[PDB]
């Protein structure tokens, strides 16, 4: 059992052509670059049959024209090993000690010279010898891991737990990293991980009490929100403290919640970290919250969210100072082996796309594992980049504890069954080297088992409760009754004047200057448009002293060239952000931050959700270029935004701004899928709205921000109505009107006793129907608008209908096809809530498989037909 | 304007320590590895302000301790340049000619020695000088590109076309690659691409007639399917032939359809290629259909589908012999620059994760572009791997032709406005070197313009038609009336006996052997379960002579350990596929292929959709581990599967198998979201079903396969009912019953005149209600099952209800919450279709924000409450 190729027999060759010193230097470079391909990193003696084996002919002395006859000759090595001269025997020895034992490293692809040299120096110095105290501490942690698993196996046989057996070195690795961070003087560590070994991490790393875990197994679950539904035990989070064992340091540790969908926690936990860093506010030399992110091998290589999130690491609005990644490589999926899971040689090969180091380490050598953890944390602190650790281990049982792995992997499980554990091997080693006594070794085991037995008995004394029905979360938060959302006239003029206080030598671009002038004049003359209404809202909130953050694709200028939140000087390329300046000059320390995102919907929306969870007192908004591209973030919508409160008791106030409208641009630029969002709504989970005037948009946003109802808000925003002159607002609407309106009654009804038809509408189609009514002089019709779709304002709708006593019909008019838009929701729910209402009649486009037509002439024909049908 | 750092002044150094020959060898290695960092590949003199600049101190002679005094001395270079000895002046010259001009290359990261040597030899030989005929051909192609764009600009000013101006070298690049493929003797080239320069490629590469394009601009659109909706002009496909200009070769060229959602065509076009290769059947040395895939720079780096699809390249069921990728790098998104779009240095850095070569080429040197195209196609044919080309160019106008790019990028568009085009520069060069006459140069322009003017006038003679309403696609395909789907008794016994004809020294695993025995005995005794019903269907179809393909996560064994389509011997690890063997021994050349996929839903389902389009006569099925994870492939469901026929006239017969059932495993293992699929259905777009017996599943699959209705099928499959003994089927049900049943009436009604309540149900809840009915001895109830959900079988439901004349109530019973499951669809549609039916009454779980509870005791309590409510 020796791992190297034996020395071969050959004749001595002459020192001609390429000199032999040159050849020895090439051998050194080869080992530094490709030595990991023959390192002792696999605990099993296993090669997967279907996988290609890389060429490693570069690592034998024959390929560099050297021979056994050169082993005792001396050569110039140019500072290798801190020496100017050396023999080939000593060169080989050192290279093999550094690059071919229990740690394999990839770092030569890095472009910066100082980085490379830092890593090179530390790897060739070697792992320092630990003290006896340190060694005993590692043994305690290994014991705790294995003991916990065995206890649960004994007391609860069939139950699903996803064990960590085969990979117990994870516990001392994570502990090493957290301990190093505490020594550096940082503030917090945030963890995200999957199912494998979660209960073990909760107990041994975070410090969740043992009584809680046992209760979970007996069927008593802790409640997150009153009347909540809940979730399985391996999807929950917690908080705790960590004290340094051989130091005076202390750090906070947290673990976040997540669904079954693998790798969906990656963008969410990045956002949490960024929000926490922003709150502490320590500048560029800060970055004092550390992200620690665990993965599995099959998921890491397969799912595309992983590289998508790593791509945000060095960008202006997303940087968090680097992430420490750990891949638990147990060499198997569920019943699938690496030959069917990836086309890369290693699972961690995405690192080479981003220019980051990789360390592969054997999971049966605990001292090496602890060293690698420390080295990774130090690299992050110095260089501020991502680092990747690959922990090579195995899975002792099946995927779960009810499965038989021999059916599909017979040969692999001949090697696994009947091995001795990592705890056993390490205990044997220490006793052998005289580093530990037998009395000590036995006490370590006995003490921990006594602790667990004690707690278990205490838990079983208390009787088991019986099941009870879950009520719901509808009334678990209060509504802001009697809150006023108007600003003063002084405040409105100051906001307007922010676009005139340009810096010293700044000028606007010729096509932007008219927009700025209109903003200064409108706050006293009238004609405020949609975009200026939105900015007035965010600006007012920033003045009061809040952190406002807006992010999305092309969101600084706007997709429709309407926002201009940051302006650029054509001559010098200087930037200017008016509202941020004004906020910072009022002494409440408010901020207005605007960012252009990368081209992602899954990672984009995920990051913003996380930001909302990490700072409860911030105002966050994500924008989509068109609302049609939001289906690329469906996982986030379904698993976090819509259902997080009911499952885990995690609350959020994220705002989604989704453009919407039927205007003839085709099937992927028309519909944000209102029907889909209205399906997800129940128990008052989130608010859904589609306002028709800038002032109403203003009032909706401000109500959300100033209330104490912590639930999301989804707004369907316009595209062509942005520049419609009939939709503009007057200043009195921002300063004298006090509240948001959920239903707006018809403002052009002469006599209410002559009305015989009522039309209900939502959004931009109002302005077409009103136009036609005026032209044809109809005094028997009344158009009523619905601004808030969910929850249903049935009291106001009832009040409006009651104002027209001679009405005979009610028409529901929408632009969308009959199987889309708000009609399906309303035809089901509204008749029950208003019993005395006449039967409703739909007027819309026909039902379709696609969203809209692709021909523009057909769109125009359809619209004419629709409005004609509405007016008999 | 010289691009190199000037030589510096210094003293001559002694030849001590590390020898100078060693230093010259290190300089050679540095240029081969990192020389691309200073190459002349950018047409503009532009450096983006916010982006980090890599260290390139490795490329100057000072860092290797050499000096101007070494330039004329001679050194040993070990075969570089085919010489044993050389001067430093000549070494620098050659290195700079190979790695620092108009082509920059990355290839040193490749692990195989033979690959590296092949590339190294060709790059250092250089680009061969082209003939005069070849040169004139390049000029014709450049002219065609620019001329086409200018014509459209003149005749249709405002209209959106997404121009290729700034990147016209794409046309000769694509032509070079296709021409090389024709010379190799291959069969077809399949193209997938986005919006940028699509109309140009359709005309100049594929050969779509010019009349068609002009008609599109005037509003007349070609119809795909009768009564279809359509799509915009830059989302369409076509077919054509390509003849070799200087050869006797000929090849077929195709371009596929796609939605606005970027990069969603990647898995689809890979599947198309694989299906076409499988049909030709030329073995391992074949792979004679070439995939050519175009991208944009922002999308390539940002979206996660890109690396997810590249990961399938070398896997057993997905390999297509390599893909040629072209990234059109115009150094801008919409209004977003690279500093805000990616954290990688180049856009093509994912290549280094997979071990593939990259070529960067200047878009203003057409001869270099043509060379790179040829070299890439040759590399693919020899090594069978992916290759990446980065074409560096610019965007002349704004994102579209109605946008002003100066507002956000002032300085960049000072360099762009008023340049001379690539056609102009190349014409000037050829006239300068005396390779072309002026008469020739003028004819090239005049002839093409005359051709375009001719066609345009012809198109405008014919009058413009007026718009007309679009009818729908419901009746555009026929239904299989009077088709019988039963097999003979001889056929059924043969299928059963396939599991007894094991190979020579093969034995089953002990826990699999009972399943095989039961399969042999059941085809005569009874008790056929769900899994055996499914396999009997696919097996029968394979025998008749069809290619049957099944793919999904853990689909060979099955998630619930139920399928065992391929078995493994514990002693030798040999594999056995019974049904494939039987099919191949019947002389119709049928196949049964089963594959375990990687852990992806987006790339997985996309690949199978593509396979169905590439071979219309195959049976394809994609399976999900649980139906809850299908929301990760929402883009494919919404943009291709549900709506492809209505938009482009592209038909498919894909089968989706999605597990479903409420059994107490929590919110991410319970619901496949039936309500969402039923929203998407309209115009008879696809079939949706939930059968309750194995024989019915058999008949449904066979009807789909043998009919001439080319639309998808979505089936909701069971989890616990797989092993329910009350659900098993007898052999007569496969051989004497002739058709699939859409409604199954109650088989335990003694007297029909005593029934006073009718219950409607679908799926596994039937077996609970029937159980209770028998226990309590209720003769006033009748339970009726609905097997096909869409389209609605209203004639059969009416017939069933008419059989109970004294019925007073109708109850709709489901397990799902009230805002989920089939209730929303049915409460809307069914009362209209059956006017005389009593009012329906729902019996279900309450409406919820999440899918299901997380506690198991609560699940049991809910189920009891539900069934009690049903029976008064
Ligand atoms: C969805 C959520 O996040 S909370 C929903 C919780 N409640 C329910 O779902 C109960 C069922 N729903 C209902 O009874 C109704 O739909 C209601 C009460 C929510 C609204 O019906 P109406 O009375 O017709 O609407 P109206 O606009 O008059 O609302 C009255 C008050 O509720 C407040 N309100 C209503 N919806 C919201 C909301 N989403 N956020 C904040 N305040 C709200 C209004 O500000 C108003 O306050 P006021 O006392 O100053 O007038
Ligand atoms: C969804 C698609 O891809 S095709 C749908 C096209 N047609 C429509 O949408 C029209 C509206 N729908 C309807 O009229 C009804 O729902 C129908 C006719 C489709 C079925 O209603 P019923 O008559 O109650 O159902 P029933 O099961 O008796 O169907 C009768 C025949 O239709 C055939 N059929 C019905 N649905 C399908 C289907 N999805 N695929 C194939 N054949 C079908 C049956 O095989 C049967 O053939 P038979 O004459 O040999 O017995
Ligand atoms: C395919 C799959 C698993 C295999 C993971 O392999 P690897 O990453 O190597 O991990 P490890 O097991 O080696 O540590 S676990 C898991 C599942 O969902 C796990 C349960 C859960 O995490 O909720 P299951 O119950 O269906 O098996 N599952 C189904 C699944 C599929 N696709 C997604 C996106 N998410 C999933 N949860
Ligand atoms: C963000 C975005 C575009 C920029 C692409 O930049 P790059 O990849 O560098 O290409 P190029 O333009 O430099 O060649 S084009 C496009 C859009 O949808 C294009 C239209 C279309 O392709 O259908 P739009 O009309 O909203 O701008 N769009 C919106 C968009 C967003 N997200 C997805 C998944 N798909 C999209 N179509
Ligand atoms: Mg694994
Ligand atoms: Mg671009």
UniProtKB/Swiss-Prot annotation, chains A, B:
Renumbered residue ranges of the record's region 2-oxoglutarate dehydrogenase E1, C-terminal part: 1-872
Effect of loss of the gene: Strains lacking this gene completely lack 2-oxoglutarate dehydrogenase activity. Deletion of odhA also causes L-glutamate overproduction and accumulation during growth.
CC annotations in GO: cytosol; oxoglutarate dehydrogenase complex
Keyword annotations from UniProtKB, A to Z: Acyltransferase, Magnesium, Metal-binding, Multifunctional enzyme, Oxidoreductase, Thiamine pyrophosphate, Transferase, Tricarboxylic acid cycle
Positions bound to thiamine diphosphate: 196, 260, 262, 297-299, 330
Sections of the chain in a coiled coil: none
One BP term from GO: tricarboxylic acid cycle
GO molecular function per UniProt: dihydrolipoyllysine-residue succinyltransferase activity; magnesium ion binding; oxoglutarate dehydrogenase (succinyl-transferring) activity; thiamine pyrophosphate binding
Notes on activation and inhibition: Inhibited by unphosphorylated OdhI, but not by phosphorylated OdhI.
Superkingdom, natural source: Bacteria
Annotated positions binding acetyl-CoA: 687, 703, 739, 742, 796
Catalytic activity, EC: 1.2.4.2, 2.3.1.61
Record keyword Transferase present: yes
Signal peptide positions (record): none
Entry binding sites for Mg(2+): 297, 330, 332
Keyword Glycoprotein appears in the UniProt entry: no
Catalysed reactions, semicolon-separated: N(6)-[(R)-lipoyl]-L-lysyl-[protein] + 2-oxoglutarate + H(+) = N(6)-[(R)-S(8)-succinyldihydrolipoyl]-L-lysyl-[protein] + CO2; N(6)-[(R)-dihydrolipoyl]-L-lysyl-[protein] + succinyl-CoA = N(6)-[(R)-S(8)-succinyldihydrolipoyl]-L-lysyl-[protein] + CoA
Cofactor: Mg(2+); thiamine diphosphate
Pathway: Carbohydrate metabolism; tricarboxylic acid cycle; succinyl-CoA from 2-oxoglutarate (dehydrogenase route): step 1/1
Swiss-Prot/TrEMBL domain comment: OdhA is a fusion protein with two major domains exhibiting structural features of an E1 and E2 protein, and a short sequence stretch of E1 localized at the N-terminus, which is connected by a linker region to the rest of the protein. Deletion of individual parts of odhA show that all parts of odhA are required for a functional tricarboxylic acid cycle in C.glutamicum; the ODH activity is in fact completely abolished in each of these mutants, and the PDH activity is significantly reduced, which could indicate that the overall structure of the supercomplex is disturbed.
Assembly notes: Homodimer. Part of an unusual ODH/PDH supercomplex, consisting of AceE (E1), AceF (E2), and Lpd (E3) together with OdhA (E1+E2). Interacts with the FHA domain of unphosphorylated OdhI via its C-terminal dehydrogenase domain.
Job description of the protein: Catalyzes the E1 and E2 reactions as part of 2-oxoglutarate dehydrogenase (ODH) activity, to convert 2-oxoglutarate to succinyl-CoA and CO(2). OdhA has reductase activity with 2-oxoglutarate but does not react with pyruvate, and also displays transsuccinylase but no transacetylase activity. Since OdhA is not lipoylated, the succinyltransferase activity of its E2 domain is dependent on lipoyl residues of the acetyltransferase AceF.
Miscellaneous: Is non-lipoylated. In contrast, the E2 component AceF is the prominent lipoylated protein in C.glutamicum.
Family in the record: In the N-terminal section; belongs to the alpha-ketoglutarate dehydrogenase family.
Annotated protein name in UniProt: 2-oxoglutarate dehydrogenase E1/E2 component
Organism, as annotated: Corynebacterium glutamicum (strain ATCC 13032 / DSM 20300 / JCM 1318 / BCRC 11384 / CCUG 27702 / LMG 3730 / NBRC 12168 / NCIMB 10025 / NRRL B-2784 / 534)
Gene expressing this chain: odhA
Residues of the full protein shown: 349 to 1220 of 1221
């Amino acid at each position: 059992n020796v791992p190297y190729t034996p020395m071969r027999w050959a004749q001595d060759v002459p020192n001609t052509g390429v000199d032999k010193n040159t050849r020895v230097m090439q051998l050194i470079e080869a080992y530094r670059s490709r030595g990991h391909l023959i390192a002792d990193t696999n605990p099993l003696s296993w090669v997967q049959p279907g996988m290609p084996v890389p060429d490693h002919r570069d690592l034998d002395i024959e390929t560099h024209n050297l021979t056994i006859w050169d082993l005792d000759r001396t050569f110039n090595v140019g500072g290798f090993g801190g020496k100017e001269t050396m023999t080939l025997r000593e060169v080989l020895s050192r290279l093999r000690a550094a690059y071919t034992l229990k740690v394999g490293s990839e770092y030569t692809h890095i472009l910066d010279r100082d980085e490379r040299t830092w890593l090179q120096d530390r790897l060739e110095a070697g792992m320092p010898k630990p003290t006896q105290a340190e060694q005993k501490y590692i043994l305690q942690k290994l014991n705790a891991a294995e003991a916990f698993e065995n206890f649960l196996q004994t007391k609860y046989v069939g139950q699903k737990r996803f064990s960590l057996e085969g990979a117990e070195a994870l516990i001392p690795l994570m502990d090493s990293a957290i301990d190093t961070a505490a020594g550096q003087g940082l503030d917090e560590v945030v963890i995200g991980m999957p199912h494998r070994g979660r209960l073990n991490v909760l107990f041994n790393i975070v410090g969740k009490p043992l009584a809680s875990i046992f209760n979970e197994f007996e069927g008593q679950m802790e409640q997150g929100q009153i009347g909540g539904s809940g979730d399985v035990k391996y999807h929950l989070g917690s908080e705790g403290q960590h004290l340094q064992m051989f130091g005076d340091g202390e750090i906070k540790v947290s673990l976040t919640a997540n669904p079954s969908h693998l790798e969906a926690v990656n963008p969410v936990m990045e956002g949490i970290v960024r929000a926490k860093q922003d709150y502490l506010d320590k500048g560029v030399d800060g970055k004092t919250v550390v992200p620690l992110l665990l993965h599995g091998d099959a998921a890491f290589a397969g799912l595309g969210i992983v590289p998508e999130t790593i791509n945000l690491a060095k960008l202006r609005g997303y940087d968090v100072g680097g992430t420490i990644h750990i891949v638990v490589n147990n060499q198997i999926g569920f019943t699938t082996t690496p030959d069917s899971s990836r086309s890369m040689h290693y699972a961690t090969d995405y690192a080479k796309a981003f220019g980051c180091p990789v360390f592969h380490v054997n999971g049966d050598d605990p001292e090496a594992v602890v060293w690698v953890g420390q080295l990774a944390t130090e690299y992050r602190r110095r260089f501020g980049k991502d680092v990747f650790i690959d922990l090579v281990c195995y899975r002792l049982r099946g995927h779960n504890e009810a499965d038989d792995p021999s059916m599909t992997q017979p040969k692999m499980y001949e090697l696994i069954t009947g091995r001795e554990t990592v705890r056993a091997q390490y205990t044997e080693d220490l006793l052998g080297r005289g580093d530990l006594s037998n009395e000590d070794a036995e006490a370590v085991v006995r003490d921990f088992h006594d602790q667990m037995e004690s707690v278990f008995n205490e838990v079983k004394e208390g009787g088991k409760k019986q099941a009870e029905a879950q009520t719901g979360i509808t009334g678990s938060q209060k509504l802001p009754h009697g809150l006023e959302t108007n600003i003063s006239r002084e405040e409105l003029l100051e906001l307007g004047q922010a676009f005139a206080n340009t810096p010293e030598g700044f000028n606007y671009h010729p096509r932007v200057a008219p927009v700025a002038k209109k903003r200064v004049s409108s706050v006293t003359e009238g004609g405020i448009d949609w975009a200026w209404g939105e900015l007035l809202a965010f600006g007012s909130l920033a003045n009061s002293g809040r952190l406002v953050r807006l992010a999305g694709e092309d969101s600084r200028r706007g997709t429709f060239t309407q926002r201009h939140a940051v302006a650029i000087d054509p001559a010098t390329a200087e930037e200017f952000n008016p509202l941020h300046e004004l906020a910072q000059s009022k002494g409440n320390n408010g901020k207005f931050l605007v960012y252009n995102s990368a081209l992602t919907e899954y990672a984009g929306m995920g990051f913003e959700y996380g930001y909302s969870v990490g700072n409860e007192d911030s105002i966050v908004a994500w924008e989509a270029q068109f609302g049609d591209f939001a289906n690329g973030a469906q996982t986030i919508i379904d698993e976090y935004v819509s259902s997080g409160e009911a499952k885990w008791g995690q609350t959020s106030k994220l705002i989604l701004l989704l453009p919407h409208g039927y205007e003839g641009q085709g099937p992927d630029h028309s519909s944000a899928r209102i029907e889909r969002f209205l399906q997800l709504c129940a128990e008052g989970s989130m608010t859904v709205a589609q306002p028709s005037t800038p002032a109403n948009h203003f009032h909706l946003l401000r109500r959300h921000a100033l209330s104490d109802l912590k639930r999301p808000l989804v707004i369907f925003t316009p595209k062509s109505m942005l520049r419609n002159k009939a939709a503009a607002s007057a200043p009195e609407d921002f300063t004298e009107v006090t509240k948001f309106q959920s239903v707006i009654n018809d403002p052009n009804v002469a006599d209410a006793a002559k009305v015989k038809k009522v039309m209900l509408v939502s959004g931009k189609l109002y302005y077409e129907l009103a136009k036609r009514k005026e032209k044809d002089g109809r005094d028997d019709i009344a158009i009523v608008r619905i601004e808030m779709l969910h929850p249903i304002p049935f009291n106001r709708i009832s009040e409006a209908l009651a104002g027209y006593p001679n009405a005979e019909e009610v028409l529901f008019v929408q632009d969308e096809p009959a199987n889309q838009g708000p009609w399906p929701f309303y035809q089901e729910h509204l008749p029950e809530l208003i019993p005395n209402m006449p039967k409703m009649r739909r007027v819309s486009r026909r039902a379709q498989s696609s969203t809209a037509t692709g021909v523009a002439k057909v769109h125009q024909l359809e619209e004419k037909q629709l409005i004609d049908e509405a007016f008999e």
